[PDB]
Amino acid sequence: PYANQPTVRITELTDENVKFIIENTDLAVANSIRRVFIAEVPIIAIDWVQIDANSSVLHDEFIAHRLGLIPLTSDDIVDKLQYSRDCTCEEFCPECSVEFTLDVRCNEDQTRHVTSRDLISNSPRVIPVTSDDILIVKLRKGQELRLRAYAKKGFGKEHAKWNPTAGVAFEYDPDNALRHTVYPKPEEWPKSEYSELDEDESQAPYDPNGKPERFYYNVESCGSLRPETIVLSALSGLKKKLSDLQTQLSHEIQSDV
Amino acid sequence: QARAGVSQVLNRLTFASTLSHLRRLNSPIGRDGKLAKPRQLHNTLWGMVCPAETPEGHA
Amino acid sequence: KQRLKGKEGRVRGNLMGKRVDFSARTVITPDPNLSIDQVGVPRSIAANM
Amino acid sequence: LNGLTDRDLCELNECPLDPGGYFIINGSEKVLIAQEKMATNTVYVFAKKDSKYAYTGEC
Amino acid sequence: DLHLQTGYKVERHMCDGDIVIFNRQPTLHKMSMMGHRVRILPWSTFRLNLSVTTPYNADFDGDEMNLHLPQSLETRAEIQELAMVPRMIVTPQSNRPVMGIVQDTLTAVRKFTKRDVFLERGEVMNLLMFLSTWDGKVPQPAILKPRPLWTGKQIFSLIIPGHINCIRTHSTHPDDEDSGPYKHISPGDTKVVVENGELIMGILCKKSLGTSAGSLVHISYLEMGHDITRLFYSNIQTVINNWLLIEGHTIGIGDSIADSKTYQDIQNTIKKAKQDVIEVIEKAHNNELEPTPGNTLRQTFENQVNRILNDARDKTGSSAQKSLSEYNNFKSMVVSGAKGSKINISQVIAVVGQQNVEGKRIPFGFKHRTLPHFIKDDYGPESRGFVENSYLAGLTPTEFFFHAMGGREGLIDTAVKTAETGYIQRRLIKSMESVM
Amino acid sequence: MIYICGECHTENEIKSRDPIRCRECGYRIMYKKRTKRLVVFDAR
Amino acid sequence: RTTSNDIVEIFTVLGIEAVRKALERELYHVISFDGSYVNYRHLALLCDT
Amino acid sequence: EITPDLWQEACWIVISSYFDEKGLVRQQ
Amino acid sequence: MIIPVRCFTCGKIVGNKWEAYLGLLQAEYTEGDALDALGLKRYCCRRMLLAHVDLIEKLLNYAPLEK
Amino acid sequence: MNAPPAFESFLLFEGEKKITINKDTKVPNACLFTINKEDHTLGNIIKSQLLKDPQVLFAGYKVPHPLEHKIIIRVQTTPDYSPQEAFTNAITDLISELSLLEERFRVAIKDKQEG
Amino acid sequence: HIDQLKEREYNNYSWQDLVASGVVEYIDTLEEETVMLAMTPDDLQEKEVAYCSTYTHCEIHPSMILGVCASIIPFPDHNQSPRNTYQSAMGKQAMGVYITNFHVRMDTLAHVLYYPQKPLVTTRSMEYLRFRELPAGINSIVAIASYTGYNQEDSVIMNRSAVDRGFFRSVFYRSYKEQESKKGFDQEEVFEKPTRETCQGMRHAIYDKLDDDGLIAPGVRVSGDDVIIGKTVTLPTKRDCSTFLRTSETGIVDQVMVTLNQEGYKFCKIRVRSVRIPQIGDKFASRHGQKGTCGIQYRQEDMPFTCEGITPDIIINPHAIPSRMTIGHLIECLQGKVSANKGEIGDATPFNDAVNVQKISNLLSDYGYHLRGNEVLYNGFTGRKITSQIFIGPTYYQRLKHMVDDKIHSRARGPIQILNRQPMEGRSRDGGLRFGEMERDCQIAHGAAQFLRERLFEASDPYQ
RNA sequence: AGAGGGAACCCACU
Ligand SMILES: [Mg+2]
Ligand SMILES: [Mg+2]
Ligand SMILES: [Mg+2]
Secondary structure, eight states, X not given: OOOOOOEEEEEEEOSSEEEEEEESOOHHHHHHHHHHHHHSOOEEEEEEEEEEEEOSSSOHXXXXXXXXXXXXXXXXXXXXXXXXXXXXXXXXXXXXXXXXXXXEEOOSSSOEEEEGGGOEESXXXXXXXXXXXXXXXXXXXXXXXXXXXXXXXXXXXXXXXXXXXXXXXXXXXXXXXXXXXXXXXXXXXXXXXXXXXXXXXXXXXXXXXXXXXXXXXXXXXXXSSOHHHHHHHHHXXXXXXXXXXXXXXXXXXXXXX | OOOOSSEEEOOXXXXXXXXXXXXXXXXXXXXXXXXXXXXXXXXXXXXXXXXXXXXXXXO | OTTTSSTTSXXXXXXXXXXXXXXXXXXXXXXXXXXXXXXXXXXXXXXXX | OTXXXXXXXXXXXXXXXXXXXXXXXXXXXXXXXXXXXXXXXXOEEEOOSSSSOSSEEEO | OOXXXXXXXXXXXXXXXXXXEEEXXXXXXXXXXXXXXXXXXXXXSEEEOTTTTTTTTOOTTTOEEEEEOOOSHXXXXXXXXXXXXXXGSBOSSSSSBSOOOOHHHHHHHHHHHSTTOEEOHHXXXXXXXXXXXXXXXXXXXXXXXXXXXEEHHHHHHHHSOTTOOEEEEOTTOOTTTTTSSOSSSOSSOOEEEEETTXXXXXXXXXXXXXXXXXXXXXXXXXXXXXXXXXXXXXXXXXXXXXXXHHHOOBOOHHHHOOOHHHHHHHHHHHHHHHHHHHHHHHHHHTTOOOOOTTOOHHHHHXXXXXXXXXXXXXXXXXXXXXXXXXXXXXXXXXXXXXXXXXXHXXXXXXXXXXXXXXXXXXXXXXXXXXXXXXXXXXXXXXXXXXXXXXXXXXXXXXXXXXXXXXXXXXXXXXXXXXXXXXXXXXXXXHHSTTOO | OEXXXXXXXXXXXXXXXXXXXXXXXXXXXXXXXXXXXXXXXXXX | OOOOSOHHHHHHHHOHHXXXXXXXXXXXXXXXXXXXXXXXXXXXXXXXX | OOOXXXXXXXXXXHXXXXXXXXXXXSOO | OOOOSBOTTTOOBOTTHHHHHHHHHHTTOOHXXXXXXXXXXXXXXXXXXXXXXXXXXXXXXXXXXXX | OOOOOGGGGTOOOTTOOSEEEEEOSSSSSEEEEEEESOOHHHHHHXXXXXXXXXXEEEEEXXXXXXXXXXXXXXXXXXXXXXXXXXXXXXXXXXXXXXXXXXXXXXXXXXXXXXX | OHHHXXXXXXXTOOHHHHHHTTXXXXXXHHHHTTOOEESOTTTTTSSSSOSOSOOOEEOSOGGGGSOSGGGGOSSGGGSOHHHHHHHHHHTTSBOSOOOTTTTTOOOSEEEEESSXXXXXXXXXXXXXXXXXXXXXXXXXXEEEBOOSSTTOTTOEEEEHHHHTTTTTOEEEEXXXXXXXXXXXXXXXXXXXXXXTTTBSOOOSSOOTTBOTTSBBOTTOEEOTTOEEEOEEEEOOOEEEOOEEOOTTOOEEEEEEEEEEOTTSOEEEEXXXXXXXXXXXXXXXXXXXXXXXXXXXXXXXXXXXXXTTOOOOSEEEOTTHHHHHTOHHHHHHHHHXXXXXXXTSOEEOOSSOSSOOHHHHHHHHHTTTSOTTSEEOOBOXXXXXXXXXXXXXXXXXXXXXXXXXXXXXXXXXXXXXOTTTOOBOOSTTTTOOOEEOHHHHHHHHHHTOHHHHHIIXXXXXXXXX
C-alpha cells in the first residue's frame, strides 16, 4: 500500500535537451510529470505592451503578439519573482514585473531588421536569449517603432507563451509486449530507437502479467530554462500542488468532523 | 423591363474570389423556371467552362 | 390588394406568422457530455433573455 | 496604369498583382458579367410539345 | 425602488433548469420543435447531444437553430408536459423511435460488444464512474483467474435499464445459422439476445440501437418510460465515448488499399467485361442481334451492355469486399451502420462504375460522339461513360468529366425538388389543419 | 489640428469647417495623426 | 379484380367508396415504393377528408 | 526533334508562355 | 506576412531561422539539406520554414504615410 | 464575447471551497471528493495511487465537463478503513515518491555534469 | 520551339511567335465537332492496336479544363464531383491576404490572415493563379481520429496552444463613411463635437473620445454603441445625427481620412480593426469539401501525441470520409508528410500518371514512418497508448468568413416597426426571430394552445 | 434621456 522507489538514468545532457529514463513507477505518474512539463512550469514572458509610436506595416497588436512570443532567460529569478495577483505592488513593481524598452527608427536607405537584440531591460538577469536573433518587424526608411513592455510570471495553463519546452517526447514499451496497441500487420512498422529486439522479429511475445514501466523521455527546451532545471521545477511544482491539496483536505476533515 | 445583375460589386474577399468573379458567365434563364435541361452540364463544355465551379441553390 | 394578397402580406406574413420577442439564434456545436433534454446556452444570450 | 512597371504601380499605391478589368463607379468597384445569348444569323430547327406546328425553323 | 413586496414581478435572467423551445428551419414534423432544459456554458454556441441531431436533421457544419423562451407558468408547464425531448422519443408517423445512437458512439458500441473485448480493473472503474444509474456494486468479472477480467457485454448489461427482453440480429448474421445447427450457440456472435435486462450474447449495431421498430431503445421506451430511456441514452453515450479514448478509431490509406491478387482479379474482370461489350457490338453491327421480347434494337442493345457493365461492377465490388481484413476501418464503419455502405467501399477500392444522365448512358452532345477525343459512332464502355478506375487510382480526364456530368444531375435534383415539396406540405396542412 | 498630406507626407495646420487643401500639395486627401493618449495592449 | 390507376374514371364508374379505397391504395404505393413506411391512420384520414 | 520522354516540361513551358503573354482578364 | 516566432505545433523557435534559410538557399543548398543544417527535424518545424511566404517584402515597397 | 479569461482554469475566486466531501448513501463506506480548479494531472495520479491500497475497493476519477474545471473522485474502502484516511495516505505516499524522484534526479544531474 | 520558349527572356520569343509559327491553333466549339483530339502526344499516337490514326489536334494539358477555383484542389480526380463543386464554392470564402494594397484601401469589409502559407501539396496551375504570392490558408498537422466525441458529424477539435501561438489568427476591417451636406437652405450638417445643452437629441453614449472637429483619432479603443463621427444638423437648437458602431464590435480605430466629395462637401472615412482569435463555432474547411465548425479546443497537454512529441493542430472525425468519398484528402495528407520530410513541394496535378499511392508510400517508408501514414499515438489525459493507429499528416486548411460572433443574436424587448408594431428584422436592428407558418403548424400538431397564443399574440404585439 | 425610415436589386449561408 506504499509508493514505488523510482530510479532515473540520464543518457544525454546538452544545452537543448535531456534524454532520461525513469524506471519502477506508474504510467499515471509518468503522464502527470510529462504534462506538468508543458503546463505547470513557471517562466517569464512579456504580458503588457504599450506602444507610443508604430508606423510599420504590422499593426500594434500584431507587434504585441510577436513580442509576447519571444522567450526570455528565466533561469534563477523566476522563483524570486511573485505573481502579480499575489504581491502588494499595485500595477507593476520590480518584485512583480520586469520592464523592457524598445526604440528603433529607420533612418537608413536599406531596410532595418528589428530583432530581439533591440529589446533593452533594466535587469541584467533577463535577456531575450542573446548571449540567432528573433525577427520582430522590418522597417522601411522613415518608419518608427517605440514601445514599453512589462514581463510577468506564469505557466502554460494560462497561455502558450509561458510554455518552457518544445515538443516533449514520451515513450514506454518500445517493443509491443503489453499489446496496448494492436498492429494488424506488425512487419510493416519501423522499430523504435529503444527497441531491444533483432531485426528479424517484429514484436516481443505477449506478457500477460506485465505492467508499464521504464518510461523514456526527451525534454527539449526552448531556451527560457535549462532542460535540466525544467524537470526539477516540474517535480517541485507537482509536490507543492499535492501538499496544498493535502493541507486543504486535512482542514476540511477537521472542519466537517 | 431591364435586365438585372449584369453589373455587380467586385468580390474582394480573396484573390481567388476576385479572379473567379472576373471570369464569370451567366445564363439569362430565370431561376423561377424550374428545368433540368438548361442547368445540366453539356458535352460541349469540354475545355470552355469549368465542370466543377457552379453555385449551389437556385442558380 | 397588394398589402394583403401574397406571401409577406398582412395575412400570411403578419398574422399566421410574425416576428416574436424573447428569441435567440446562434451556431450549434456538439456536446456529448449533455443529456438529450439539455441545451448549452452562452452566457451573453442567457443574460439578454 | 497602362504599360507601367511594378515600381511605378507601387509608387501610385496600386498592387502589381491586381489584374484590373473592372470599373470604378462612385468609388465602388463594378464588374461586368458576360451574358449568354442564342447565336444569330443561323438556322435552327426545333419541335415543341403542344404547339400546333409540327416542325419550326427560326433564324 | 429596490423594495420588493408580494404580487410584484421580477424579470430575472435565464438560469439553469429553465425550459426553452429549440427549433430548426425547415420545420417538417413536430419533432423539429422540442423542449429542452437550459445549461449555461462558456463560449458563444448552442450545445446539444448527438442523439437529438437526427430529428432536427442537423449537422455541425454551420447550422443555426432558434431558441424560444416561454414567459409564463402556463406555457412553461405546457412545454414541460407536452413537448419535452424524452416525450418525443417515439414518433406517431411510423410508430418507431426517432432518435438513435449515431456516429462514434455506434461505431464504438459494436467494437465494445464484440466477443474478444476484455476489460481490466482500472478501466472497469473508470467506465463505471460514467454511469448515472449505477447502484455502486461492482459485478463479478466474467474471468476470475489467472487475473480478473470483465467483458464489454457485462458493462453494457449494467447500462441496460430495468428487465428489458429483446431479440435482434447483427448485420453480418449468416442466413444459414438458424436453419442448421449452432442456432443458440452462435459461432460469429451475431444473434443479439437480451434477457432480464442483461446482454447474454450478440453484437450491437444499427439494427438493435438505431431508429427502427423493435429496437432495444424502442422496447426500453415502451417498457420503462421516457425518463429511464433518457438516462439510458446518456449512459450509453458517456460510457462508450469514454471507452473510445482507450480504443481509438481512424481511417486512412491502408483501409482504402487492397492487395495485388485482388487488383489483378479486378483488372481481369474489367478486361472480360470490355471484351464482352466488344463482342455484343460486333453482333449488333453484323445484324446478328435478336431483339429481346418487347424491345427495339436500341433498347435490347442498351439493356445487354448495361447488364454486362452492372454485372462487372457487382463482381468487382464483391471481390473488393471479400478482400477486406477484420481490422479494416471502412468495414468497421459499414458494419456498425454509422456511416458508409458497401457500394461506397466498392467505388473507393475497385470500380466507380457507369455514369448516368437522366437515367440513361452519356448522350452524344457532339455530332455522334460524346467528346471530340472519341471516334464517331463508338458505343463502347469508355466512350459512353463507364469508369474503369477507382477513386484510389484516380478517375481518365474523360472519366473525370463524365463523373462531373453525373454529379451535376444530383445537385440539380436537390436544388429543384424543395419548392414543390414545400408547396405540397403547405397545401396538405391548410386542408387538414382543423381536423380534431 | 495637424493632418498628414497625401503624397507630400507633410504636417499642415488646418482650421475646422474649412476646405481640405494641402500646403504646397495639389492633393485633396489628408489623414489624421496618431492619438496622444496611451493605449494598453495585452500579448495574450 | 380489374382496376386502373386513374382516380376520376374509377370514381365515375364505381363510386365514392371505391375511389376512396383506390386513392388509399395509390397513396400507399407511391409512399412505400421507396421502402418507407407510414402509419395507416394518416392515409385513412387524408382519403376520408 | 521530337520529345518522347520529357513532355511535362515542354507542356508546362508552353502553358507558362501562354499565361505570361495573355493573362487572366484578357477577354475583358 | 512575416515568419512566425514559434512553430504552431511544438513551440520551437523558428523566427531566427528565416534569414539563415534564405542565405543557405542563396548558397545553393538543397532545401532539405538547409532544413537539416538549421536543426529542424520534426516535419512541423520543417513545414513552418518550407511553406512560408514572405509578404512583408512586398508590403515595404509602398511609400510610408509618415515621414 | 463569451470567452472566459484564461486564469479561471486554475484560480479559485471568492466563495469556492477547494475540496468538498459528500458521503455516498447507495453503498456503505463510500465518499465522493469534489476538487475544484484541477484536472487529469492530479486526478489520474491520485486514482492510480489509490488503486495500490489493498483496502480500497473502488477508486476512480472523472471530469463532468471539459469546459468546467472540477473533479469527482469516488473512493470505497473496506470496513474499519475510511476513504478520507485512504486519500490522505495516497497524497502523503505520492509526495514521498516525488521527493525520492527529485533527489535521485539531482544526483543523476550531478553525476552526468563533470563526471 | 521548346528551347526558344525556355530562353523566353532576353530573346522576345513568346506565345505570339509560337502561334504565328503554325504549331498552335485556336478552336471554338463549332470547329471542335470536326476534329480528332488526343490526350497525350505519344501515349495516344504510338503504334498499337489501331483505334484512330487520323488525329488532327492534340491537347496541351488535360488539366486546363478546370477553372480558377477548381485548379487549387490537390488530386481532384480522386474526389467525388459534388465535393469538388463544394470546394470550388468555398474557395471564394477562404480568408487570406486578398491584395497587397490593403493598407490604403478603405473597403467596407475586409479579412486578412496573420500567417498565410503556400500549400505543401500544390498544383502546377497555382503558379499562374498567383496562389503562392497571395495564399489563403495554413498547413496544419491533421489527425483523423475519434478522440472525445466533440468532433462528431462535421465538427473539428482544435489545439488551443497552437491558437495561442498565432494559428489562424486574423484581423477584421470595417470602414464607416459619413458625408456632411447642405441638404436644405436652412438645413446644414457640420462635423463638430456635440454638447448636451445645445443638441436636441443626445443618446446615453459618451462623446468624450471625439475631438473638437467631431472625428475620433486613430489609435483609440472603441466598443459597442460608441460615437466615432460627430455630425449635428441645425433645427429650424441642433439635432444630433452622429453615427455609432455596430453592436458588440469592440475594435480599435485604424485610419481616419478626410477629403472633399464631388459636391465639394467635407467627407470622412474611418477604418476600424478587430482581431479574431478562432473560437468554438468558427468555420474551417479543407480543399476537398470537408467543412465544419470548431467543436472544442484542447491545450497541448490534453491533445494526443506521437513518439516524437508532435500533437495535431486539428482533429477531424473519420465519419466524414466514407460517405463523401474524398480520398484526395488522404492522398494530400500522405503527400504532405512525404514533402515535409523530404524538403520539397509536392505535385498534385490532376492527370499525372507519374505519381501513385504506392510510390508515395515507398517514399514515406524511407524516412522512418509507416508507409500508409499511420502512427502510434498516446492518450493525452492518461498517457496510455491508443489501440488503433491514427492516420496523421500535414493538410492545407482554410478559415472561412463565417464566424459565430457575426451570427450570435438575442432579443428580449426592443425596437418595433412603425406600421404593424411588430419587432424589427435583422441582427443590426436588434430584431426578432420569425415564428413562421411551419412553426405555427408544428405547435398546432403539438397541441400547445397557450404557447401558440403567447408566441403569436403575447410575445409579439398585444393591443386593446 | 428610448432614439432611428422605406423599397428594389445582387451576393452568400443551412
Ligand atoms: Mg443529421
Ligand atoms: Mg444535415
Ligand atoms: Mg448543415
